[PDB]
Design a protein around this nucleic acid. Structure first.
Lengths: 86, 82, 199, 87, 67
RNA sequence: GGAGAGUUUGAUCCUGGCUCAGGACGAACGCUGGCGGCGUGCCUAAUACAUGCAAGUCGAGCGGACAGAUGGGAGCUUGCUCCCUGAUGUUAGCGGCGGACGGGUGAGUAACACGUGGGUAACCUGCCUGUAAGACUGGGAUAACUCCGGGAAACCGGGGCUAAUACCGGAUGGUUGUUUGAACCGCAUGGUUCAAACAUAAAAGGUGGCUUCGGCUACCACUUACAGAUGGACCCGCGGCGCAUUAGCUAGUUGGUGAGGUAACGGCUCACCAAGGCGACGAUGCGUAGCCGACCUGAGAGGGUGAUCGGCCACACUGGGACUGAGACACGGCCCAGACUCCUACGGGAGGCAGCAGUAGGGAAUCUUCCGCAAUGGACGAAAGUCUGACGGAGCAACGCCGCGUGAGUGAUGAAGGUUUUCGGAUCGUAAAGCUCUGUUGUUAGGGAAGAACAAGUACCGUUCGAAUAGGGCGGUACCUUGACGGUACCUAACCAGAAAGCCACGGCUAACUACGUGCCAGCAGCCGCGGUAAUACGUAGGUGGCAAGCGUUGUCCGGAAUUAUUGGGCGUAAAGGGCUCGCAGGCGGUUUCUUAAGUCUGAUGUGAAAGCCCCCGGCUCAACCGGGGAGGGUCAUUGGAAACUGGG
């Protein structure tokens, strides 16, 4: 980069990328757990996992990494699949 | 409550599930010579129950995209084919 | 640019007095150059239209571009095209000062105006093409109220047209109304001028 | 943000200004939202025309005048009506 | 020409100084009576000298005003 | 609101082309050249680029360094010296915002890219206003700074330490998700309001003032919801290029089921089903092109153009990709690949002018490696202020438009001299000379704007917070500060007609004729055509004519051209009827009545940005130019009406 600000922006950009990946990965991990607990039919784990999935999803939104509409969609999808168990 | 574009037209195809090809016909003036010419516009419409069959005069309303080409929904079948 | 060449030959070539007095057509009332005396040739329709155009243009001393642009401006005014055109030409400041009699000739007038000896409503205007409007008062600047050349013209001058008014004591004239063409040079056949430009 | 600012018109050495409402991002002499008046600083005194109704409408929506426009509105008494309306 | 086209150009005026490899400027304008001659060489541009001793319509033959 | 002319012939009338008179230009070239105002200036190689600049800002978010030093000790040479941490100051680094705007170019693109009219109940929106509710309790890191290694350096790795409005748990939350009730209303999916349970999800401090020193308070910042505004995204009707010597194209292609993905509908992607979709009302392919407001032309219909200015789109050495973010798949950001270039100590690094100047190259051809942030507009800041090749100015170019000069009056004796001459004379000619006069301009002096609005800072007034008589916010009011242009414009005075006219043409079209030289030679030519010993057509000279700081030539566009004829042409012999029939599609269609309302006509409403063209006013001494107010503009959309004609029954 040529401009001093651009050099700092490159460093800042990569650091934020790393942090966001951790946050987004954790959120996806939580979604996967809920989807696993529905395939093998375990309401309690699925129901508690869903709280954890809701936690992770909304955490990403607070920061701004995931859009409100995207979070709502994920939550709706997961919540309905969990009702299917019962 | 703004209204969508309505088109009274004639079904031309019904071979697809839930999809009819309506056609709208009109006389448009020719830009230079002024002769009225037949203009025909095809439209893909959505009809869930497959009411309209090939030949019917159907009224369709505009909608959000429902597929690659479908932008209208069947409202009524004004006149069924004999 | 502005024609600084001999004057009379223009009158002789055109077969009208450009000064209006006559004196250019006394001895040799025929075109300049060695073919003037003998030849008595007739002009085509194009020649007549062009000759009439040059009559008006050279009388008032205006270049062709400015002349033609002014003709188009008259076009938009209501009434007779040719008549309006000639009213505008008379409204030129160098012409108006000349008609008021502050200068013996239009060339002298234009130099007075160009050099900044004239006032229009108390404000200096050193542009011969200025289009004097009805009501404005043409005056001489205080610095030039006592110029020999202008004194001469003011005495010798007789007959200031009726559409103008003048005061030799104050050396300030007024443009009270429009000429209307009855007052203006009758030698000119404005009909030919309108035709000339429709070509 | 929406600004009330001066659009430069006229020619070299003879500036003339329109007071236009415009998105800050828009080029000075380009896209604008609405014209509100004119400002001729070279004349003596400076001629200022403002449409009060329109000026107030935008001030109440939250468009901030530029420094010079703010000065204009003050001298024309537009800022007074704006403050008093909010109270 | 610079565009690779080959053209025949007429040299106006009395006498000229063009040989092979002379760089010349051409302009439009046919020579009515020379089949296939559709362009004129501009006198007084690039290598083409003005016309010697020309005194009227000099501008058309690239001859500077004498004193 | 519309003009024609020459040219086929021995002559004529037709047909028919060719040529000319007009307007325009980002023009170039030749000759020539005084000035001012206002515009314009790489149209070709989206070719390659040396060098400088074009995006920073915030210390009132944060730590650490470095100065500065009110005073203390200090060791002694009265010559200086530390050692704190004064205030105060500077900023390499972290952090926030900006960098997605402004600026450039028109390569790609025949497409919902653009224009126009709608739609989104399929959408997003930082900063800016308004409303309401908050801002509780804890924690671990890391850059800077130090030490190690590599490297000539640039720069590149590792160990250790430290802070935040950086980052992360938990508490309370009106969003969001699931479930369940109601009320009302749409255009199918549905939309709006209320209620309940359950589950998740916030936040930050800084500056100043006052304090009983607990804290309170103002401002800035922070969090959430709802509006508003702004900006963006998507879909649709219609419109706008050439080629049929391009006729078939398509296979996620066209629909459906489900899932995934998106801010969001959607084959947007996938898996599985069916075989559908587009096309002679021109698909597909090829070629060409950014589109438009507008600009040029024309009586108009049209034709051409898409430079400058404004809107939208696309692009950033070539190709792809994603990250950060409210916003990019990012001109002066990152990653990979390719082409190319540069530095080097050969270890390793570095770059992208279609930003402003400028260089090379290409070309007939287009500018200064300029001044300033004073004005206007942006970014950051509480503010001062910093940054701004946007922009405001100046520079170069007669490139264009407008304006003004290069003198004025008198002046015959019609001087000299040039040209011509039937030798008388004519002509350049009132033109010189002479006499008088002027100073635009030039040269030299003196004076000299406007463009400037401000802000901050205090000092008062009103009002709003607050415990405040503190201190802020908001509005009003004094006072102060600031000009690149530029000592430019403009004004005044003095001297001098002195420095400042060229270009083309003169046979006819077409305004303007003679002499000499030449002798089908040299040459001329837009067309008819000139020139072969009397050339008004060649060359020169004199005179004349048309323009004039310009004038001609060439090139390009429109007109004339009714010469693609819708307006507005033709096909017996001038170019033009298919060799003839049958016939699909298509085009067109007899009479009466009823009905419908697609075409058709009509009322109202909405819309067609600014600039531009037109009309009317006003400011530059006039004009160009600038400004204000209107008018005008559509096979446009929503919603009524009429029914003669066309269409449907």
């Amino acid at each position: 980069p040529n401009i001093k600000s651009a050099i700092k922006r490159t460093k800042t950009n990569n650091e934020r990328r790393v942090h966001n990946a951790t946050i987004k990965s954790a959120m996806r991990t939580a979604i996967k757990q809920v989807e696993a607990s529905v395939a093998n039919n375990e309401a309690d784990k699925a129901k508690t996992a869903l709280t954890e999935a809701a936690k992770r999803i909304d955490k990403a939104v607070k920061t701004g990494l995931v859009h409100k509409n995207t979070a709502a969609r994920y939550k709706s999808r997961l919540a309905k699949k969990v009702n299917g168990l019962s | 409550r703004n209204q969508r574009k309505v088109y009274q037209g004639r079904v031309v195809s019904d071979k697809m599930d839930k999809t009819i090809t309506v056609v709208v016909e009109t006389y448009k003036k020719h830009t230079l010579y002024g002769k009225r010419v037949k203009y025909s516009k095809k439209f893909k419409a959505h009809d869930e129950n497959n009411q309209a069959k090939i030949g019917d005069i159907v009224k369709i309303m505009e909608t959000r995209p429902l597929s690659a080409t479908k932008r209208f929904r069947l409202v009524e079948v004004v006149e069924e084919a004999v | 640019a502005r024609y600084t060449g001999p004057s009379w030959k223009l009158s002789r070539r055109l077969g009208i007095s450009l000064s209006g007095t006559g004196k250019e057509l006394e001895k040799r009332p025929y075109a300049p150059g060695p073919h003037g005396p003998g030849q008595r040739k007739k002009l085509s329709e194009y020649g007549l239209q062009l000759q009439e155009k040059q009559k008006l243009r050279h009388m008032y001393g205006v270049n062709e571009r400015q002349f033609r642009t002014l003709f188009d401006k008259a076009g938009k005014l209501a009434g007779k095209h040719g008549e309006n055109f000639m009213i505008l030409l008379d409204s030129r400041l160098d012409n108006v000062v000349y008609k008021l009699g502050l200068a013996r000739t239009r060339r002298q007038a234009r130099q007075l105006v160009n050099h900044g000896h004239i006032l229009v409503d108390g404000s200096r205007v050193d542009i011969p093409s200025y289009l004097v409007k009805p009501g404005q008062t043409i005056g001489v600047r205080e610095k030039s109220r006592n110029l020999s050349i202008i004194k001469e013209s003011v005495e010798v001058n007789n007959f200031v047209p009726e559409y103008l008014t003048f005061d030799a004591e104050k050396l300030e004239g007024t443009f009270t109304r429009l000429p209307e063409r009855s007052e203006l040079a009758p030698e000119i056949n404005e009909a030919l001028i309108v035709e000339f430009y429709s070509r | 943000a929406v600004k009330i600012r001066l659009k430069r018109m006229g020619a070299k050495k003879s500036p003339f200004y329109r007071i236009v409402v415009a998105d800050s991002r828009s080029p000075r002499d380009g896209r604008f939202i609405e014209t509100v008046g004119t400002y001729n600083p070279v004349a003596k005194p400076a001629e200022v025309k403002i449409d009060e109704e329109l000026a107030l409408k935008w001030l109440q929506t939250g468009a901030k005048p530029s420094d010079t426009v703010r000065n204009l509105f003050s001298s024309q008494g537009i800022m007074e009506k704006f403050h008093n309306a909010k109270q | 020409l610079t565009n690779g086209i080959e053209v025949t150009a007429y040299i106006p005026g009395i006498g000229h100084n063009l040989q092979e490899h002379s760089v010349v400027l051409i302009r439009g304008g046919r020579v009515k009576d020379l089949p296939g001659v559709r362009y004129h060489i501009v006198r007084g541009a690039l290598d083409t000298a003005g016309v010697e001793n020309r005194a009227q319509g000099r501008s058309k033959y690239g001859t500077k005003k004498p004193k």
